[PDB]
Amino acid sequence: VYAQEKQDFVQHFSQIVRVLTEHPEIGDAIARLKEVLEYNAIGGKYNRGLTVVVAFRELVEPRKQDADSLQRAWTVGWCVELLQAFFLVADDIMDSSLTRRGQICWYQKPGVGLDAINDANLLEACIYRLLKLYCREQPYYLNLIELFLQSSYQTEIGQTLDLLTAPQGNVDLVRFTEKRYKSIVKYKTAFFSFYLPIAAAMYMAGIDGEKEHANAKKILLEMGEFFQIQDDYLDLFGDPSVTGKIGTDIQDNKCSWLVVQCLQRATPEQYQILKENYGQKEAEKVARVKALYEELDLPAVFLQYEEDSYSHIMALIEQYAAPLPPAVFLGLARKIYKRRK
Amino acid sequence: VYAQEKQDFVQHFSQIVRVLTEHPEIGDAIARLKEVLEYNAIGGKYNRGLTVVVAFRELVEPRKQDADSLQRAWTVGWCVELLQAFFLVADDIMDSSLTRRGQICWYQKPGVGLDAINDANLLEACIYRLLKLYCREQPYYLNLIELFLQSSYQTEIGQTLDLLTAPQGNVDLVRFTEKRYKSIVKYKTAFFSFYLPIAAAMYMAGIDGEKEHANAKKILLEMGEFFQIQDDYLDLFGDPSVTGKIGTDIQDNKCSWLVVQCLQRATPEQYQILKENYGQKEAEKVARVKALYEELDLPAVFLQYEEDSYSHIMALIEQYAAPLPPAVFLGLARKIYKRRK
Numbered sequence A, B: 001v002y003a004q005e006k007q008d009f010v011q012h013f014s015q016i017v018r019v020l021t022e023h024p025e026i027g028d029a030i031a032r033l034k035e036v037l038e039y040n041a042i043g044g045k046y047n048r049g050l051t052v053v054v055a056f057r058e059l060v061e062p063r064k065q066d067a068d069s070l071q072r073a074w075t076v077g078w079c080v081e082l083l084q085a086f087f088l089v090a091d092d093i094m095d096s097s098l099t100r101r102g103q104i105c106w107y108q109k110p111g112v113g114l115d116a117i118n119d120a121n122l123l124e125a126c127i128y129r130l131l132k133l134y135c136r137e138q139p140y141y142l143n144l145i146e147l148f149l150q151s152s153y154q155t156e157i158g159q160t161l162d163l164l165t166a167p168q169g170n171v172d173l174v175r176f177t178e179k180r181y182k183s184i185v186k187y188k189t190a191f192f193s194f195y196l197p198i199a200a201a202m203y204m205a206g207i208d209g210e211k212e213h214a215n216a217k218k219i220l221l222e223m224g225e226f227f228q229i230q231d232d233y234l235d236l237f238g239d240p241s242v243t244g245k246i247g248t249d250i251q252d253n254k255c256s257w258l259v260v261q262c263l264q265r266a267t268p269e270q271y272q273i274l275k276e277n278y279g280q281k282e283a284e285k286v287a288r289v290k291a292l293y294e295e296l297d298l299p300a301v302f303l304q305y306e307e308d309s310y311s312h313i314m315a316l317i318e319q320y321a322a323p324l325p326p327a328v329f330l331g332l333a334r335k336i337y338k339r340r341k
């Protein structure tokens, strides 16, 4: 259903750009906004934007799916894609990344640099511009504004947790626990990537109940934790030509799922190898950490976690999906299960 | 009236921090938010926050100024101070600044660096948290959310214009015109610093009329243009112990009011001196540009502009203040007239 809707969803980007780039004095700034939008909102899997589109089709009665209603749905999907673009442009600066989605990071582009900070905020500003342009007269207008605002705050608190546990130049092996990992990942990824697209479609379909949103959240935050674990696995063991980005977690002293599991299985001698080689820019030290991971059979430990966690998410769908069609959660789950990009 | 209300307004910051820093898992992130708030929202003149407080007192009938009403007013004032903090933390990174408000820029602090990007977004997130906590049940709640969102977009478009006209490593003397200057300054400063605090107080007082907001805007955008001109003058000719920040406009190849006037009065020989020495990090080249400014009597040209512009703003107050008390605009105008900090 995602694979089918992909070309239809991407075809609507042209309109999104047209409406956002429509006063001659700000001409150069609006021209730069188009360049920012084209570079940073295109090239990913569009899982978040498509989740809004697919979930709205499954939650709204077909006779109530008019052309204006469907336009609002993929506009809101594109708003989640812009939120993604905002966080990625800033995250690549802060993680000193090289590539994103098969091309050099926007801030690494000659002539951009730290101007990417303001470009990132512009991407965030376009969300509320589109919500005003297409959803201002709708009963769920305020619920969507607050949902996009709260999802941004939650991600930013998660990003604070990610950066505080990963100080440059300091050994922070003590703080790389399972409890700390779950808290980072819940806030930095699980809310905006999984709860936000489904919650937006739910509000657009008139499902605004506290209990329904709490039940959907129980499934989606677990799906999010699992998705970040896959992302951490891919940082080191994924193919950069497929993933589109070069890994930096070891160099960046990140509280990765991999380092958390390494610490749980490592011998005192192996702990010292990790202490001496983690969180440093040296290629030989990064190679040493990877060798330790492969030695502790961490790629196979990931295969077993992925199996066990997927069954747990399936048990959560069975418990908390009702009254929503289970396909809403199953579609996204199958889209991310056994991920390689 | 500003001078009197200053200590009262600053005394409320403790509550603002308490309510924003009130889940044990996010403890370290919330602790970092307090550090960000204390470092970056304190030390300025509080002109924007005080404008909300003073204007709300002058627009609302005293019998309608209850304790809850007054708390909402200085909370909204503090929301404008957080918007200021957000833009300043990011602007200092992008302008490669050293000091702000008498202390080293937050990003220049050891252990902060580019993590300041996420800290800046957290400051922006706190605005909407405070609006939800204190104004969610009020009739002007949505008008304030949209006003803070539109004022952020306008500033960001202004910041895009500021950065596009100031490329590092390129001579952009051709684009340093009066028409381009007016457009940068209108968007980057005039909207959020002058229109936003008065417009917020107007909405809180129930004055939501399009015509009234347009009349107030005509005065306040001119006041804003004037305020940025003073800021550009102070960048080079102000005392860093008084202003609290070290100037970077010449080094940063900025389209400053000073360089616009220099180009309008310079001889072809003087134009070449400017071409060869502007927009470069070399101390001897910056000293050369300053010498040219002093040679063209630019400090005296600023004294005359400040006089003529203040009379024009006074003519605009006389024309467009009604039905609002002129003291609303006069208070802010006298607070910024002959500025040195």
Ligand SMILES: O=P(O)(O)C(O)(Cc1cccnc1)P(=O)(O)O
Pocket: A087, A088, A091, A095, A155, A159, A188, A189, A231, A235, A245
């Ligand atoms: O794409 P990335 O950089 O692997 C990531 O997933 C990006 C990201 C940005 C913001 C929130 N969550 C994840 P990260 O956490 O840095 O591993």
Ligand SMILES: O=P(O)(O)C(O)(Cc1cccnc1)P(=O)(O)O
Pocket: B087, B088, B091, B095, B155, B159, B188, B189, B231, B235, B245
């Ligand atoms: O404090 P600054 O850096 O002099 C300034 O006024 C800061 C600022 C930030 C954002 C919008 N407007 C002004 P700038 O424009 O860089 O001269």
Ligand SMILES: C=C(C)CCOP(=O)(O)OP(=O)(O)O
Pocket: A043, A044, A045, A046, A047, A084, A101, A188, A189, A193, A227, A228, A231, A341
């Ligand atoms: C929140 C995370 C883990 C960042 C990357 O998400 P995606 O893997 O969905 O990246 P894109 O498809 O948008 O490129």
Ligand SMILES: C=C(C)CCOP(=O)(O)OP(=O)(O)O
Pocket: B043, B044, B045, B046, B047, B084, B101, B188, B189, B193, B227, B228, B231, B341
């Ligand atoms: C928008 C501009 C010109 C930035 C500085 O404003 P202020 O001069 O008001 O600085 P603070 O008092 O908040 O420190």
Ligand SMILES: [Mg+2]
Pocket: A091, A095, A162
């Ligand atoms: Mg990151």
Ligand SMILES: [Mg+2]
Pocket: A091, A092, A095, A097
């Ligand atoms: Mg990253």
Ligand SMILES: [Mg+2]
Pocket: A231, A232, A235
């Ligand atoms: Mg990653």
Ligand SMILES: [Mg+2]
Pocket: B091, B095, B162
């Ligand atoms: Mg600037």
Ligand SMILES: [Mg+2]
Pocket: B091, B092, B095, B097
């Ligand atoms: Mg600056």
Ligand SMILES: [Mg+2]
Pocket: B231, B232, B235
């Ligand atoms: Mg300045």
